[PDB]
């Protein structure tokens, strides 16, 4: 071919030196790594082996099957994963799952397996039935799941959906709310269904039935649209539990644009605690999920599993309510007709001043 | 939203013809491939049509870089090439030069640098790429090397012109951190175009891209008694924080202080009130960068720098300064709000 | 392999298409094949013939999606001659194998809805009376309105089309008969009624409340959105297949079977005597002037 | 014996049911039998499969009632392998055996209608863009509006359902975009738009004119009755059978073939509002409602 001995006799260096480069920067002065890496590139030279160029002094090589990095939560996690995996001197190989469902995910795994990975993290939302089908596909390779579900028997880490829903409900019940609406994610999504189940569960335990229930698509816009729809249908709760912070944003807008006050008239609770919620108007009470932690933890755990020790269990991570300004004790006090008529008059005056 | 049948009935050719172009040179007089390939490009149409490519990126934590890499990975798949990301924490050129030396060790056939660098440093990095094609998604327009970016010149211009045209004279800037090239360029641009309208900003401040910083800096400014009629902000998130600062300072966004963002994120359409901003399509930047990189890896493409258009997205944070009477559109909105309140009465 | 025959009304018609779709669709999932025989009308000889065809094609089970009164349904079951036969349109009182929606419930819910909103002056708008489904629906309305000491002030007969709903309603209002509410036999006639009302200078809901039947995709966006009775035809179709396979192995409900329905409250139902200058009517007037305002020059 | 296979979209959907009805119906009159194979979903592998089934059932001719772009329609025709195949959904520019309605006409008529009523501010509401029928319709609208020196002021994408017509129209008006006319890709979305408009404090026709497509039974009773483009699907279905029998005896138009459509003028179309009230007259009206409000 173009050999390892050709790279060397024209570039002026030994075959210990060309072979020390092929691996990683160690005992060769950084100034002689320019005489080699330009002599390799200007004659096209490469590995075999190419997993013989991942041959030492040890590897853990880990595969991740994830939802789109477009989406905020999955990016947080993978960031953390990649990040932490680095600290531990293991490498990460992502395989994105442009949707949707289990055949999609089963495929993303069969890829990672073809790339001879030593462990798997599944960051893709699956109901328990399907998660089992996937675990089947992992075939003698340790597999940690960051989204299940149904309880599950397998290796998992998740945040407590039970806690999240409980905290929110309890918060509002304790502020003395009785008229409550839910705004869930799309129901194709397992995470949405779990969240909603949770809300029902705990509201039932406080002798409460939600006065309305709706379904967004995770986007703020859908939070606005559904909330608008609802208020226009004359349904006007004192509080809303919302399945993520972005829909909560859209709800808040719907409310505000409907002539109501967020908190003082309709309290709202989110989920996720995104960077931006702290500066919504007003700042948004929500459930914190530390995705960076989930990601980082999942790596420690996976390395352990790949040496036959760890929790071969399922594992939960705590969450927490973050009180801010969208939660206040209920209030149906609301402007009097005389006050509205006055506001109207003011705009009639402004109107008459136009062309 | 331009289709295949729009490319054809303005450029004077059939569908068999537009559809024979999309595929390849088969029996194409490259002559009539000029009537089509300019009508595709001058309407904005994007057709459904080993290479191993490395990406050096900022943290995927951050929104923009995730968008891009997503689009990259995604598109690279369609083309049967694989992507290998190397994340850069954090800060500076040695950081980034290192991330590259890794990707090179993994014997990649092309490089995309999605990490913000000033032109001096971008050169230093290009030096490190050593006989391997390297496309940069963050430098300035001035660079000699292979790049794709959005027009910072346009973005800044549009925003300024927007507010001047609404008749604003008292304007404050809220920039990104100045370690960041993208922030500096944006700020330079704002100064450039405000100068061209005989205006000097009344205040200038520096966030860190986070909303919280937008709030903190705007708060500080208003508390220092500096109260502009408009703000140009370097991204949508800081704009959110500014809006909050304003609102919590007893003022109305738009009516009292107009605000303009940058990026057009998913959520800005539902800020309160919805946010006027400059659209940058990161999915497109990412996808494009791959096509371009494959071409470079076969000798041909723009070995040039390349710009991508942007656009102003008018919404509700921009209104003529509160010196003027409110506009009919602003009144009609207020009126809608009361009609909603009214319908919730009974007596 | 199960091979199953369907005798259906025209696929032109919305409901029967829903069903056969669901049938074909589900039958696929279960690895059985479907063979449709359409019955371009009308009545029992028509339907007895459609069956004699399917039988000639050696099918292993029959679904009869064609509307029949109980007498005639028996005559047809006679024709099926040692081949399992599931009927998707008869009454609840039949001996044979059937699945239907509860006509008793549908009618009850609608009446109760309006009585509970306090309506006393009510008109019925039924389907054509050649149609069994229309007669059952009408019987039901009479039954429950009687149980609330009410006699309808008018009663009319469309042909299922919206246009007929308009025409009959127009006729009625022009005859000076002006109820506070209408029970209508399907959503499309309800559309036509609503138009007749609106074009007669009246308000749907506020002046005359209207209730539909079927809950079609589009009723949620009628003007105003239409209170109606939900019937899930996809479900009926899909269910009928499961059931038929079971019957073809001796076991299942050799019974008749009912499927629930539900009232869907929307904006065509409001208490009588609203009357005039409610907050909602003022807010509407306001909205109009806001639009006019926004058309001005600054 | 003449035995004919149909590959169709879901019978759930209104149009395809109309067609197959007509097909089955007419095929009966002619003493041939029909065998349907439904397609879900979606795209060309789906449809290539539905055909490979029908072929296994040894049919003597094929009707493809499933929407396909010209590229894919060819791929399917390849699959038909020596069996006559009539397509009820492609474009006019295909080589193969087809019958369709004139999309060129439909779009032209609607545009010309509104231009002739003197509209300059126009919005489009298209079907989903995964759908070829939607893309063709939209292309057509662009083509003819361009020919009248007009660019639409907005452009949106439903999913064929009324609800989406409402949602997109609501979105658009809330974005402060307020055209004088709308071209809509089917009658149901047009219903939803009409609602969005009406509920937005505006008048359909007088303020915003709307045009549909299909002419469904119900559009004649929308509020107000809906100007729309008529497509007679019964005819398409019936015609496709005559034509197929002829093809199966080596004679007919081995051509593509078009069917006319027609504009149906009703009440959602009127000349744009020339006229406004003065600010002083509005302010007075506003005062009046403030007085009424203060009693309540």
mmCIF file of N, CA, C and O in Angstrom, chain A residues 248-312:
data_model
loop_
_atom_site.group_PDB
_atom_site.id
_atom_site.type_symbol
_atom_site.label_atom_id
_atom_site.label_comp_id
_atom_site.label_asym_id
_atom_site.label_seq_id
_atom_site.Cartn_x
_atom_site.Cartn_y
_atom_site.Cartn_z
ATOM 1 N N UNK A 248 -46.687 25.975 29.665
ATOM 2 C CA UNK A 248 -47.084 26.864 30.717
ATOM 3 C C UNK A 248 -46.910 28.285 30.272
ATOM 4 O O UNK A 248 -47.699 29.148 30.615
ATOM 5 N N UNK A 249 -45.882 28.544 29.498
ATOM 6 C CA UNK A 249 -45.670 29.866 28.973
ATOM 7 C C UNK A 249 -46.837 30.284 28.123
ATOM 8 O O UNK A 249 -47.293 31.410 28.196
ATOM 9 N N UNK A 250 -47.268 29.382 27.262
ATOM 10 C CA UNK A 250 -48.346 29.642 26.318
ATOM 11 C C UNK A 250 -49.640 29.815 27.048
ATOM 12 O O UNK A 250 -50.409 30.645 26.705
ATOM 13 N N UNK A 251 -49.829 29.079 28.117
ATOM 14 C CA UNK A 251 -51.012 29.250 28.926
ATOM 15 C C UNK A 251 -51.013 30.622 29.531
ATOM 16 O O UNK A 251 -51.970 31.368 29.374
ATOM 17 N N UNK A 252 -49.926 30.974 30.184
ATOM 18 C CA UNK A 252 -49.794 32.295 30.807
ATOM 19 C C UNK A 252 -50.140 33.417 29.837
ATOM 20 O O UNK A 252 -50.736 34.412 30.215
ATOM 21 N N UNK A 253 -49.726 33.254 28.595
ATOM 22 C CA UNK A 253 -50.005 34.242 27.594
ATOM 23 C C UNK A 253 -51.494 34.256 27.327
ATOM 24 O O UNK A 253 -52.113 35.301 27.365
ATOM 25 N N UNK A 254 -52.079 33.087 27.101
ATOM 26 C CA UNK A 254 -53.524 32.977 26.857
ATOM 27 C C UNK A 254 -54.299 33.664 27.965
ATOM 28 O O UNK A 254 -55.250 34.387 27.713
ATOM 29 N N UNK A 255 -53.860 33.455 29.189
ATOM 30 C CA UNK A 255 -54.522 34.045 30.326
ATOM 31 C C UNK A 255 -54.425 35.541 30.343
ATOM 32 O O UNK A 255 -55.402 36.239 30.530
ATOM 33 N N UNK A 256 -53.221 36.007 30.169
ATOM 34 C CA UNK A 256 -52.935 37.408 30.219
ATOM 35 C C UNK A 256 -53.690 38.149 29.125
ATOM 36 O O UNK A 256 -54.354 39.162 29.394
ATOM 37 N N UNK A 257 -53.589 37.631 27.910
ATOM 38 C CA UNK A 257 -54.304 38.167 26.759
ATOM 39 C C UNK A 257 -55.796 37.984 26.893
ATOM 40 O O UNK A 257 -56.540 38.598 26.157
ATOM 41 N N UNK A 258 -56.263 37.132 27.806
ATOM 42 C CA UNK A 258 -57.714 37.011 28.046
ATOM 43 C C UNK A 258 -58.235 38.001 29.073
ATOM 44 O O UNK A 258 -59.364 37.919 29.497
ATOM 45 N N UNK A 259 -57.405 38.950 29.466
ATOM 46 C CA UNK A 259 -57.801 39.947 30.449
ATOM 47 C C UNK A 259 -57.690 39.487 31.874
ATOM 48 O O UNK A 259 -58.158 40.175 32.755
ATOM 49 N N UNK A 260 -57.026 38.366 32.107
ATOM 50 C CA UNK A 260 -56.834 37.849 33.457
ATOM 51 C C UNK A 260 -55.396 38.009 33.932
ATOM 52 O O UNK A 260 -54.481 38.285 33.134
ATOM 53 N N UNK A 261 -55.213 37.873 35.239
ATOM 54 C CA UNK A 261 -53.888 37.891 35.871
ATOM 55 C C UNK A 261 -53.428 36.472 36.231
ATOM 56 O O UNK A 261 -54.117 35.723 36.907
ATOM 57 N N UNK A 262 -52.234 36.126 35.794
ATOM 58 C CA UNK A 262 -51.605 34.907 36.205
ATOM 59 C C UNK A 262 -51.283 35.011 37.694
ATOM 60 O O UNK A 262 -50.810 36.053 38.143
ATOM 61 N N UNK A 263 -51.527 33.935 38.452
ATOM 62 C CA UNK A 263 -51.333 33.901 39.916
ATOM 63 C C UNK A 263 -52.575 34.387 40.649
ATOM 64 O O UNK A 263 -53.327 33.588 41.265
ATOM 65 N N UNK A 264 -52.776 35.704 40.577
ATOM 66 C CA UNK A 264 -53.827 36.383 41.314
ATOM 67 C C UNK A 264 -55.206 35.924 40.925
ATOM 68 O O UNK A 264 -56.057 35.764 41.790
ATOM 69 N N UNK A 265 -55.412 35.658 39.640
ATOM 70 C CA UNK A 265 -56.679 35.102 39.159
ATOM 71 C C UNK A 265 -56.571 33.589 38.879
ATOM 72 O O UNK A 265 -57.349 32.767 39.443
ATOM 73 N N UNK A 266 -55.614 33.220 38.035
ATOM 74 C CA UNK A 266 -55.340 31.805 37.740
ATOM 75 C C UNK A 266 -53.911 31.412 38.015
ATOM 76 O O UNK A 266 -53.009 31.896 37.390
ATOM 77 N N UNK A 267 -53.707 30.550 38.977
ATOM 78 C CA UNK A 267 -52.371 30.106 39.287
ATOM 79 C C UNK A 267 -51.976 29.050 38.268
ATOM 80 O O UNK A 267 -52.812 28.276 37.801
ATOM 81 N N UNK A 268 -50.688 28.981 37.980
ATOM 82 C CA UNK A 268 -50.152 28.030 37.037
ATOM 83 C C UNK A 268 -48.910 27.339 37.579
ATOM 84 O O UNK A 268 -48.039 27.988 38.154
ATOM 85 N N UNK A 269 -48.806 26.029 37.361
ATOM 86 C CA UNK A 269 -47.613 25.279 37.720
ATOM 87 C C UNK A 269 -47.030 24.546 36.524
ATOM 88 O O UNK A 269 -47.749 23.876 35.771
ATOM 89 N N UNK A 270 -45.720 24.638 36.363
ATOM 90 C CA UNK A 270 -45.048 24.003 35.231
ATOM 91 C C UNK A 270 -44.466 22.652 35.575
ATOM 92 O O UNK A 270 -44.950 21.946 36.481
ATOM 93 N N UNK A 271 -43.440 22.290 34.819
ATOM 94 C CA UNK A 271 -42.699 21.052 34.989
ATOM 95 C C UNK A 271 -41.420 21.127 34.178
ATOM 96 O O UNK A 271 -41.480 21.477 33.020
ATOM 97 N N UNK A 272 -40.288 20.808 34.796
ATOM 98 C CA UNK A 272 -38.942 20.763 34.181
ATOM 99 C C UNK A 272 -37.983 21.735 34.838
ATOM 100 O O UNK A 272 -36.785 21.437 35.020
ATOM 101 N N UNK A 273 -38.503 22.902 35.181
ATOM 102 C CA UNK A 273 -37.652 24.065 35.551
ATOM 103 C C UNK A 273 -36.553 24.457 34.555
ATOM 104 O O UNK A 273 -35.372 24.342 34.864
ATOM 105 N N UNK A 274 -36.947 24.960 33.389
ATOM 106 C CA UNK A 274 -35.974 25.380 32.387
ATOM 107 C C UNK A 274 -35.269 26.663 32.789
ATOM 108 O O UNK A 274 -35.750 27.389 33.633
ATOM 109 N N UNK A 275 -34.111 26.908 32.185
ATOM 110 C CA UNK A 275 -33.304 28.082 32.494
ATOM 111 C C UNK A 275 -34.234 29.297 32.430
ATOM 112 O O UNK A 275 -34.278 30.104 33.359
ATOM 113 N N UNK A 276 -35.043 29.389 31.382
ATOM 114 C CA UNK A 276 -35.838 30.577 31.163
ATOM 115 C C UNK A 276 -37.046 30.809 32.097
ATOM 116 O O UNK A 276 -37.544 31.921 32.215
ATOM 117 N N UNK A 277 -37.545 29.782 32.773
ATOM 118 C CA UNK A 277 -38.779 29.945 33.562
ATOM 119 C C UNK A 277 -38.608 30.968 34.672
ATOM 120 O O UNK A 277 -39.548 31.562 35.122
ATOM 121 N N UNK A 278 -37.386 31.113 35.153
ATOM 122 C CA UNK A 278 -37.115 32.011 36.249
ATOM 123 C C UNK A 278 -37.421 33.424 35.818
ATOM 124 O O UNK A 278 -37.634 34.286 36.678
ATOM 125 N N UNK A 279 -37.442 33.668 34.508
ATOM 126 C CA UNK A 279 -37.759 35.013 33.955
ATOM 127 C C UNK A 279 -39.020 35.128 33.117
ATOM 128 O O UNK A 279 -39.205 36.118 32.439
ATOM 129 N N UNK A 280 -39.897 34.132 33.170
ATOM 130 C CA UNK A 280 -41.233 34.311 32.619
ATOM 131 C C UNK A 280 -41.902 35.445 33.390
ATOM 132 O O UNK A 280 -41.398 35.915 34.404
ATOM 133 N N UNK A 281 -43.037 35.899 32.895
ATOM 134 C CA UNK A 281 -43.698 37.069 33.477
ATOM 135 C C UNK A 281 -45.106 36.668 33.893
ATOM 136 O O UNK A 281 -46.007 36.560 33.067
ATOM 137 N N UNK A 282 -45.312 36.421 35.174
ATOM 138 C CA UNK A 282 -44.336 36.433 36.228
ATOM 139 C C UNK A 282 -43.546 35.103 36.315
ATOM 140 O O UNK A 282 -43.938 34.084 35.718
ATOM 141 N N UNK A 283 -42.428 35.117 37.051
ATOM 142 C CA UNK A 283 -41.651 33.908 37.195
ATOM 143 C C UNK A 283 -42.483 32.707 37.613
ATOM 144 O O UNK A 283 -43.417 32.851 38.366
ATOM 145 N N UNK A 284 -42.113 31.536 37.129
ATOM 146 C CA UNK A 284 -43.018 30.429 37.052
ATOM 147 C C UNK A 284 -42.754 29.384 38.085
ATOM 148 O O UNK A 284 -41.697 28.808 38.114
ATOM 149 N N UNK A 285 -43.745 29.098 38.916
ATOM 150 C CA UNK A 285 -43.639 27.996 39.826
ATOM 151 C C UNK A 285 -43.620 26.703 39.032
ATOM 152 O O UNK A 285 -44.463 26.514 38.133
ATOM 153 N N UNK A 286 -42.688 25.801 39.349
ATOM 154 C CA UNK A 286 -42.503 24.615 38.523
ATOM 155 C C UNK A 286 -41.800 23.522 39.258
ATOM 156 O O UNK A 286 -41.253 23.731 40.312
ATOM 157 N N UNK A 287 -41.798 22.347 38.667
ATOM 158 C CA UNK A 287 -41.104 21.202 39.210
ATOM 159 C C UNK A 287 -39.736 21.045 38.622
ATOM 160 O O UNK A 287 -39.601 20.816 37.457
ATOM 161 N N UNK A 288 -38.720 21.053 39.441
ATOM 162 C CA UNK A 288 -37.379 20.923 38.935
ATOM 163 C C UNK A 288 -36.971 19.482 38.576
ATOM 164 O O UNK A 288 -37.072 18.564 39.386
ATOM 165 N N UNK A 289 -36.489 19.299 37.352
ATOM 166 C CA UNK A 289 -35.832 18.051 36.951
ATOM 167 C C UNK A 289 -34.424 18.398 36.476
ATOM 168 O O UNK A 289 -34.275 19.118 35.482
ATOM 169 N N UNK A 290 -33.403 17.922 37.199
ATOM 170 C CA UNK A 290 -32.028 18.246 36.874
ATOM 171 C C UNK A 290 -31.514 17.234 35.881
ATOM 172 O O UNK A 290 -31.007 16.174 36.241
ATOM 173 N N UNK A 291 -31.640 17.570 34.617
ATOM 174 C CA UNK A 291 -31.265 16.676 33.562
ATOM 175 C C UNK A 291 -29.768 16.478 33.465
ATOM 176 O O UNK A 291 -29.308 15.420 33.077
ATOM 177 N N UNK A 292 -28.996 17.504 33.776
ATOM 178 C CA UNK A 292 -27.548 17.348 33.790
ATOM 179 C C UNK A 292 -27.198 16.217 34.762
ATOM 180 O O UNK A 292 -26.370 15.369 34.472
ATOM 181 N N UNK A 293 -27.854 16.190 35.907
ATOM 182 C CA UNK A 293 -27.570 15.166 36.883
ATOM 183 C C UNK A 293 -27.947 13.780 36.384
ATOM 184 O O UNK A 293 -27.213 12.805 36.555
ATOM 185 N N UNK A 294 -29.103 13.701 35.737
ATOM 186 C CA UNK A 294 -29.554 12.426 35.209
ATOM 187 C C UNK A 294 -28.531 11.887 34.249
ATOM 188 O O UNK A 294 -28.218 10.695 34.258
ATOM 189 N N UNK A 295 -27.996 12.778 33.426
ATOM 190 C CA UNK A 295 -27.061 12.372 32.391
ATOM 191 C C UNK A 295 -25.767 11.894 32.984
ATOM 192 O O UNK A 295 -25.255 10.849 32.621
ATOM 193 N N UNK A 296 -25.263 12.653 33.927
ATOM 194 C CA UNK A 296 -23.985 12.364 34.518
ATOM 195 C C UNK A 296 -24.035 11.094 35.329
ATOM 196 O O UNK A 296 -23.127 10.264 35.287
ATOM 197 N N UNK A 297 -25.111 10.953 36.082
ATOM 198 C CA UNK A 297 -25.332 9.772 36.903
ATOM 199 C C UNK A 297 -25.408 8.514 36.071
ATOM 200 O O UNK A 297 -24.871 7.496 36.446
ATOM 201 N N UNK A 298 -26.065 8.618 34.927
ATOM 202 C CA UNK A 298 -26.265 7.485 34.074
ATOM 203 C C UNK A 298 -24.964 6.902 33.560
ATOM 204 O O UNK A 298 -24.925 5.752 33.146
ATOM 205 N N UNK A 299 -23.896 7.678 33.588
ATOM 206 C CA UNK A 299 -22.620 7.196 33.094
ATOM 207 C C UNK A 299 -21.884 6.406 34.167
ATOM 208 O O UNK A 299 -21.390 5.284 33.909
ATOM 209 N N UNK A 300 -21.788 7.002 35.354
ATOM 210 C CA UNK A 300 -21.214 6.330 36.503
ATOM 211 C C UNK A 300 -21.885 4.981 36.547
ATOM 212 O O UNK A 300 -21.215 3.940 36.492
ATOM 213 N N UNK A 301 -23.218 4.992 36.585
ATOM 214 C CA UNK A 301 -23.967 3.752 36.696
ATOM 215 C C UNK A 301 -23.652 2.791 35.583
ATOM 216 O O UNK A 301 -23.523 1.604 35.806
ATOM 217 N N UNK A 302 -23.547 3.279 34.371
ATOM 218 C CA UNK A 302 -23.284 2.353 33.293
ATOM 219 C C UNK A 302 -21.902 1.675 33.385
ATOM 220 O O UNK A 302 -21.795 0.489 33.137
ATOM 221 N N UNK A 303 -20.865 2.418 33.750
ATOM 222 C CA UNK A 303 -19.546 1.821 33.927
ATOM 223 C C UNK A 303 -19.559 0.743 34.936
ATOM 224 O O UNK A 303 -18.938 -0.298 34.756
ATOM 225 N N UNK A 304 -20.256 0.990 36.032
ATOM 226 C CA UNK A 304 -20.375 -0.019 37.070
ATOM 227 C C UNK A 304 -21.055 -1.275 36.521
ATOM 228 O O UNK A 304 -20.550 -2.373 36.705
ATOM 229 N N UNK A 305 -22.169 -1.114 35.821
ATOM 230 C CA UNK A 305 -22.857 -2.258 35.229
ATOM 231 C C UNK A 305 -22.001 -3.048 34.299
ATOM 232 O O UNK A 305 -22.178 -4.256 34.159
ATOM 233 N N UNK A 306 -21.102 -2.361 33.606
ATOM 234 C CA UNK A 306 -20.223 -3.007 32.633
ATOM 235 C C UNK A 306 -19.067 -3.733 33.320
ATOM 236 O O UNK A 306 -18.271 -4.354 32.651
ATOM 237 N N UNK A 307 -18.967 -3.620 34.645
ATOM 238 C CA UNK A 307 -18.087 -4.478 35.446
ATOM 239 C C UNK A 307 -18.866 -5.360 36.439
ATOM 240 O O UNK A 307 -18.366 -5.674 37.522
ATOM 241 N N UNK A 308 -20.102 -5.726 36.082
ATOM 242 C CA UNK A 308 -20.868 -6.737 36.834
ATOM 243 C C UNK A 308 -21.207 -6.485 38.313
ATOM 244 O O UNK A 308 -21.317 -7.452 39.067
ATOM 245 N N UNK A 309 -21.327 -5.224 38.757
ATOM 246 C CA UNK A 309 -21.598 -4.948 40.200
ATOM 247 C C UNK A 309 -22.916 -4.232 40.614
ATOM 248 O O UNK A 309 -23.678 -4.699 41.519
ATOM 249 N N UNK A 310 -23.182 -3.128 39.914
ATOM 250 C CA UNK A 310 -24.079 -2.018 40.371
ATOM 251 C C UNK A 310 -25.471 -2.443 40.712
ATOM 252 O O UNK A 310 -25.803 -3.625 40.698
ATOM 253 N N UNK A 311 -26.291 -1.444 41.019
ATOM 254 C CA UNK A 311 -27.711 -1.653 41.064
ATOM 255 C C UNK A 311 -27.939 -2.258 39.692
ATOM 256 O O UNK A 311 -27.764 -1.567 38.680
ATOM 257 N N UNK A 312 -28.223 -3.558 39.645
ATOM 258 C CA UNK A 312 -28.894 -4.093 38.491
ATOM 259 C C UNK A 312 -30.368 -3.639 38.611
ATOM 260 O O UNK A 312 -31.138 -3.798 37.654
#
